[PDB]
Amino acid sequence: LLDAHNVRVVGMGSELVVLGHGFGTDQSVWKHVIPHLVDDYRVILFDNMGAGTTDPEFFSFSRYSTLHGYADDLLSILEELEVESCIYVGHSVAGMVGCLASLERPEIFTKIITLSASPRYLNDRDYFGGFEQDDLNQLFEAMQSNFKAWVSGFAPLAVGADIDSMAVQEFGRTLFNIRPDIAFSVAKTIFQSDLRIMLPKVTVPCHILQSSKDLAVPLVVADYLHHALGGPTIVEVLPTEGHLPQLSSPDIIIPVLKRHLAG
Protein backbone atom coordinates (compact mmCIF):
# COMPACT_ATOMS: atom_id res chain seq x y z
CA LEU A 1 0.00 0.00 0.00
CA LEU A 2 1.10 3.58 0.76
CA ASP A 3 2.50 4.05 -2.76
CA ALA A 4 -0.77 2.90 -4.34
CA HIS A 5 -2.61 5.52 -2.25
CA ASN A 6 0.18 8.16 -2.20
CA VAL A 7 0.23 8.08 1.61
CA ARG A 8 2.12 11.01 3.15
CA VAL A 9 2.83 11.55 6.86
CA VAL A 10 3.80 15.15 7.72
CA GLY A 11 3.89 17.17 10.92
CA MET A 12 5.43 17.37 14.39
CA GLY A 13 2.30 17.66 16.53
CA SER A 14 1.17 15.36 19.29
CA GLU A 15 -2.06 14.02 17.76
CA LEU A 16 -2.59 11.92 14.63
CA VAL A 17 -5.22 13.29 12.23
CA VAL A 18 -6.16 11.57 8.95
CA LEU A 19 -7.43 13.63 6.01
CA GLY A 20 -9.68 11.99 3.42
CA HIS A 21 -10.88 13.57 0.18
CA GLY A 22 -14.22 13.42 -1.66
CA PHE A 23 -15.05 12.57 -5.26
CA GLY A 24 -13.31 14.54 -8.02
CA THR A 25 -10.21 15.75 -6.16
CA ASP A 26 -7.32 14.19 -4.23
CA GLN A 27 -5.24 14.89 -1.13
CA SER A 28 -4.24 18.20 -2.77
CA VAL A 29 -7.66 19.56 -1.72
CA TRP A 30 -6.03 20.09 1.70
CA LYS A 31 -3.20 22.18 0.17
CA HIS A 32 -4.11 25.36 2.07
CA VAL A 33 -4.80 23.50 5.33
CA ILE A 34 -1.71 21.29 5.79
CA PRO A 35 0.65 24.22 6.61
CA HIS A 36 -1.65 25.17 9.52
CA LEU A 37 -1.76 21.67 11.07
CA VAL A 38 1.85 20.42 11.06
CA ASP A 39 2.78 22.45 14.18
CA ASP A 40 -0.13 21.00 16.17
CA TYR A 41 -0.76 17.60 14.54
CA ARG A 42 0.92 14.73 12.70
CA VAL A 43 -0.90 14.60 9.37
CA ILE A 44 -1.47 11.51 7.22
CA LEU A 45 -2.90 12.14 3.75
CA PHE A 46 -3.98 9.60 1.16
CA ASP A 47 -5.86 9.27 -2.12
CA ASN A 48 -8.91 7.10 -2.74
CA MET A 49 -8.44 4.30 -5.25
CA GLY A 50 -9.69 5.53 -8.62
CA ALA A 51 -8.65 9.17 -8.33
CA GLY A 52 -6.55 10.86 -11.00
CA THR A 53 -3.32 10.64 -8.99
CA THR A 54 -3.70 6.85 -8.62
CA ASP A 55 -3.04 3.92 -10.93
CA PRO A 56 -6.41 2.30 -11.70
CA GLU A 57 -5.17 -0.22 -14.25
CA PHE A 58 -7.26 -3.12 -12.95
CA PHE A 59 -9.86 -1.25 -10.95
CA SER A 60 -12.21 -3.71 -9.28
CA PHE A 61 -15.62 -2.19 -9.98
CA SER A 62 -17.06 -4.84 -7.63
CA ARG A 63 -14.81 -3.87 -4.72
CA TYR A 64 -15.96 -0.24 -4.98
CA SER A 65 -19.65 -0.80 -5.77
CA THR A 66 -20.18 -0.01 -2.06
CA LEU A 67 -18.29 2.41 0.16
CA HIS A 68 -16.92 -0.63 2.04
CA GLY A 69 -14.10 -0.90 -0.51
CA TYR A 70 -12.94 2.63 0.25
CA ALA A 71 -13.41 1.99 3.98
CA ASP A 72 -11.25 -1.16 3.86
CA ASP A 73 -8.56 0.85 2.08
CA LEU A 74 -8.51 3.40 4.92
CA LEU A 75 -8.29 0.64 7.54
CA SER A 76 -5.55 -1.19 5.62
CA ILE A 77 -3.55 2.05 5.37
CA LEU A 78 -3.92 2.86 9.07
CA GLU A 79 -3.15 -0.81 9.74
CA GLU A 80 -0.04 -0.61 7.53
CA LEU A 81 1.04 2.64 9.22
CA GLU A 82 0.46 0.84 12.56
CA VAL A 83 -2.00 3.57 13.57
CA GLU A 84 -3.96 2.62 16.70
CA SER A 85 -5.62 5.95 17.54
CA CYS A 86 -6.24 9.08 15.49
CA ILE A 87 -8.66 11.85 14.61
CA TYR A 88 -10.27 11.32 11.20
CA VAL A 89 -11.38 14.25 9.03
CA GLY A 90 -13.40 13.24 5.97
CA HIS A 91 -14.43 15.59 3.17
CA SER A 92 -17.65 14.68 1.32
CA VAL A 93 -17.71 10.91 0.62
CA ALA A 94 -14.66 10.39 2.85
CA GLY A 95 -16.85 11.47 5.76
CA MET A 96 -19.15 8.47 5.37
CA VAL A 97 -16.11 6.28 4.69
CA GLY A 98 -14.61 7.20 8.06
CA CYS A 99 -17.95 6.55 9.74
CA LEU A 100 -18.21 3.21 7.92
CA ALA A 101 -14.60 2.36 8.79
CA SER A 102 -15.19 3.37 12.42
CA LEU A 103 -17.90 0.71 12.57
CA GLU A 104 -15.20 -1.87 11.92
CA ARG A 105 -12.50 -0.43 14.24
CA PRO A 106 -14.01 2.24 16.53
CA GLU A 107 -11.02 2.09 18.88
CA ILE A 108 -8.83 3.53 16.12
CA PHE A 109 -10.91 6.72 15.89
CA THR A 110 -11.20 9.07 18.85
CA LYS A 111 -13.02 11.73 16.81
CA ILE A 112 -14.56 12.01 13.33
CA ILE A 113 -15.02 15.33 11.52
CA THR A 114 -17.17 15.28 8.39
CA LEU A 115 -17.02 18.15 5.89
CA SER A 116 -19.74 18.42 3.22
CA ALA A 117 -20.65 14.78 3.91
CA SER A 118 -23.98 13.11 3.18
CA PRO A 119 -25.43 9.62 3.76
CA ARG A 120 -27.85 9.95 0.83
CA TYR A 121 -28.27 12.41 -2.05
CA LEU A 122 -31.57 11.12 -3.44
CA ASN A 123 -34.78 12.37 -1.86
CA ASP A 124 -37.15 9.96 -0.12
CA ARG A 125 -40.16 9.86 2.18
CA ASP A 126 -39.46 12.39 4.96
CA TYR A 127 -35.86 12.93 3.80
CA PHE A 128 -34.56 15.84 1.70
CA GLY A 129 -31.31 14.81 0.04
CA GLY A 130 -31.28 17.40 -2.74
CA PHE A 131 -31.73 15.34 -5.92
CA GLU A 132 -34.27 13.23 -7.78
CA GLN A 133 -33.46 10.18 -9.89
CA ASP A 134 -34.13 12.16 -13.08
CA ASP A 135 -31.68 14.77 -11.79
CA LEU A 136 -29.14 11.95 -11.49
CA ASN A 137 -30.03 10.41 -14.88
CA GLN A 138 -29.37 13.67 -16.74
CA LEU A 139 -26.02 14.06 -14.99
CA PHE A 140 -24.92 10.49 -15.74
CA GLU A 141 -25.83 10.77 -19.43
CA ALA A 142 -24.23 14.22 -19.70
CA MET A 143 -21.01 12.77 -18.25
CA GLN A 144 -21.04 10.06 -20.95
CA SER A 145 -22.21 12.43 -23.70
CA ASN A 146 -19.16 14.71 -23.35
CA PHE A 147 -17.18 14.24 -20.13
CA LYS A 148 -15.10 17.37 -20.70
CA ALA A 149 -18.16 19.52 -21.39
CA TRP A 150 -19.73 18.19 -18.17
CA VAL A 151 -16.66 18.94 -16.02
CA SER A 152 -16.66 22.52 -17.32
CA GLY A 153 -20.18 22.96 -15.90
CA PHE A 154 -20.08 20.71 -12.84
CA ALA A 155 -16.92 22.12 -11.25
CA PRO A 156 -18.42 25.65 -11.18
CA LEU A 157 -21.47 24.28 -9.35
CA ALA A 158 -19.68 21.96 -6.92
CA VAL A 159 -17.17 24.59 -5.80
CA GLY A 160 -19.60 27.45 -6.36
CA ALA A 161 -18.17 30.83 -7.34
CA ASP A 162 -16.87 31.92 -10.76
CA ILE A 163 -15.76 29.65 -13.59
CA ASP A 164 -12.42 31.51 -13.47
CA SER A 165 -11.84 31.09 -9.72
CA MET A 166 -8.72 29.20 -8.65
CA ALA A 167 -10.57 26.50 -6.70
CA VAL A 168 -12.76 25.84 -9.74
CA GLN A 169 -9.74 25.48 -12.05
CA GLU A 170 -8.08 23.05 -9.63
CA PHE A 171 -11.15 20.91 -8.95
CA GLY A 172 -12.22 20.74 -12.59
CA ARG A 173 -8.64 19.80 -13.46
CA THR A 174 -8.54 16.91 -10.97
CA LEU A 175 -12.13 15.96 -11.81
CA PHE A 176 -11.23 15.82 -15.51
CA ASN A 177 -8.12 13.71 -14.83
CA ILE A 178 -10.21 10.73 -13.69
CA ARG A 179 -10.35 7.92 -16.24
CA PRO A 180 -13.85 8.43 -17.68
CA ASP A 181 -15.08 4.84 -17.36
CA ILE A 182 -14.22 5.08 -13.64
CA ALA A 183 -15.55 8.60 -12.96
CA PHE A 184 -19.04 7.77 -14.25
CA SER A 185 -19.13 4.46 -12.35
CA VAL A 186 -17.84 5.97 -9.10
CA ALA A 187 -20.25 8.91 -9.44
CA LYS A 188 -23.05 6.35 -9.72
CA THR A 189 -22.02 4.53 -6.53
CA ILE A 190 -21.67 7.83 -4.66
CA PHE A 191 -24.69 9.77 -5.94
CA GLN A 192 -26.99 6.74 -5.50
CA SER A 193 -25.58 5.68 -2.12
CA ASP A 194 -27.82 5.32 0.93
CA LEU A 195 -25.90 4.95 4.20
CA ARG A 196 -28.69 6.06 6.56
CA ILE A 197 -29.10 2.55 8.02
CA MET A 198 -25.46 2.64 9.14
CA LEU A 199 -25.63 5.98 10.99
CA PRO A 200 -27.19 4.84 14.32
CA LYS A 201 -24.47 2.18 14.64
CA VAL A 202 -21.80 4.93 14.84
CA THR A 203 -20.50 5.45 18.38
CA VAL A 204 -17.43 7.64 17.72
CA PRO A 205 -18.06 11.36 18.41
CA CYS A 206 -18.71 13.18 15.14
CA HIS A 207 -18.34 16.89 14.40
CA ILE A 208 -20.48 17.75 11.38
CA LEU A 209 -19.16 20.74 9.47
CA GLN A 210 -21.26 21.93 6.56
CA SER A 211 -21.47 24.96 4.30
CA SER A 212 -24.66 26.99 4.63
CA LYS A 213 -24.86 26.93 0.81
CA ASP A 214 -23.87 23.49 -0.50
CA LEU A 215 -25.45 22.37 -3.76
CA ALA A 216 -24.68 18.67 -3.19
CA VAL A 217 -25.68 18.75 0.51
CA PRO A 218 -28.68 20.79 1.75
CA LEU A 219 -28.37 22.35 5.21
CA VAL A 220 -31.04 19.94 6.50
CA VAL A 221 -28.63 17.03 5.95
CA ALA A 222 -26.36 18.38 8.71
CA ASP A 223 -29.14 18.22 11.31
CA TYR A 224 -30.13 14.75 10.07
CA LEU A 225 -26.63 13.44 10.79
CA HIS A 226 -26.73 15.10 14.22
CA HIS A 227 -29.90 13.15 15.05
CA ALA A 228 -29.00 9.92 13.20
CA LEU A 229 -25.44 9.20 14.38
CA GLY A 230 -25.63 6.93 17.42
CA GLY A 231 -22.71 8.65 19.14
CA PRO A 232 -22.25 12.20 20.44
CA THR A 233 -22.56 14.84 17.73
CA ILE A 234 -22.31 18.58 17.16
CA VAL A 235 -23.16 20.70 14.11
CA GLU A 236 -21.38 23.89 13.06
CA VAL A 237 -22.54 25.73 9.94
CA LEU A 238 -19.76 27.38 7.95
CA PRO A 239 -20.50 30.90 6.61
CA THR A 240 -19.37 29.85 3.13
CA GLU A 241 -20.69 28.54 -0.18
CA GLY A 242 -19.38 25.42 -1.89
CA HIS A 243 -18.74 21.68 -1.68
CA LEU A 244 -14.96 22.05 -1.19
CA PRO A 245 -14.68 25.08 1.13
CA GLN A 246 -11.25 24.08 2.47
CA LEU A 247 -10.00 24.75 -1.09
CA SER A 248 -12.09 27.79 -2.06
CA SER A 249 -12.34 29.44 1.39
CA PRO A 250 -9.47 28.21 3.60
CA ASP A 251 -9.42 31.50 5.53
CA ILE A 252 -12.75 30.53 7.12
CA ILE A 253 -12.50 26.73 7.21
CA ILE A 254 -9.08 26.44 8.88
CA PRO A 255 -9.98 28.14 12.22
CA VAL A 256 -13.18 26.08 12.46
CA LEU A 257 -11.43 22.79 11.67
CA LYS A 258 -8.64 23.40 14.18
CA ARG A 259 -11.19 24.42 16.80
CA HIS A 260 -12.97 21.08 16.36
CA LEU A 261 -9.64 19.24 16.21
CA ALA A 262 -8.57 20.81 19.52
CA GLY A 263 -11.96 20.72 21.28
TrEMBL record:
<protein>
    <recommendedName>
        <fullName>AB hydrolase-1 domain-containing protein</fullName>
    </recommendedName>
</protein>
<dbReference type="Pfam" id="PF00561">
    <property type="entry name" value="Abhydrolase_1"/>
</dbReference>
<dbReference type="InterPro" id="IPR029058">
    <property type="entry name" value="AB_hydrolase_fold"/>
</dbReference>
<dbReference type="InterPro" id="IPR000073">
    <property type="entry name" value="AB_hydrolase_1"/>
</dbReference>
<dbReference type="GO" id="GO:0016787">
    <property type="term" value="F:hydrolase activity"/>
</dbReference>
<feature type="domain" description="AB hydrolase-1">
    <location>
        <begin position="16"/>
        <end position="174"/>
    </location>
</feature>
<keyword id="KW-0378">Hydrolase</keyword>
<comment type="similarity">
    <text>Belongs to the AB hydrolase superfamily.</text>
</comment>
